[PDB]
Design a protein around this nucleic acid. Structure first.
Length: 74
RNA sequence: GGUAGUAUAACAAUAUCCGUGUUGUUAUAGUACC
């Protein structure tokens, strides 16, 4: 691997989750290394992911919440 | 003076459950590095 394929994580979440909420935590830093932690809320379970910039944060959250809440989609 | 990052905004392409995302190009600004 190298160029990865996070598009998979995004779409996969969308599939399992036709409607949910994304919310941001942290997001502060020196000036050029901002830490963003975006957490996704599904069915009352909230999973948090930390990325530099907005990209990876929500992404990683999607991955987590996927493996997680698929055990309780209702 | 030059180099760089982050953020906001616009356009296009790509994928798409049309909701959204990824990618590419451009513009503006504090700061950081030399």
């Amino acid at each position: 691997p190298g160029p990865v394929l996070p598009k998979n994580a995004l779409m996969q979440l969308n599939e399992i989750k036709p409607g949910l909420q994304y919310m941001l935590l942290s997001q502060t830093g020196p000036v050029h290394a901002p830490l963003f932690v975006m957490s996704v809320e599904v069915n009352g379970q909230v999973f948090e992911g930390s990325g530099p910039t907005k990209k990876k944060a929500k992404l990683h959250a999607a991955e987590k919440a996927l493996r997680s809440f698929v055990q309780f989609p209702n």
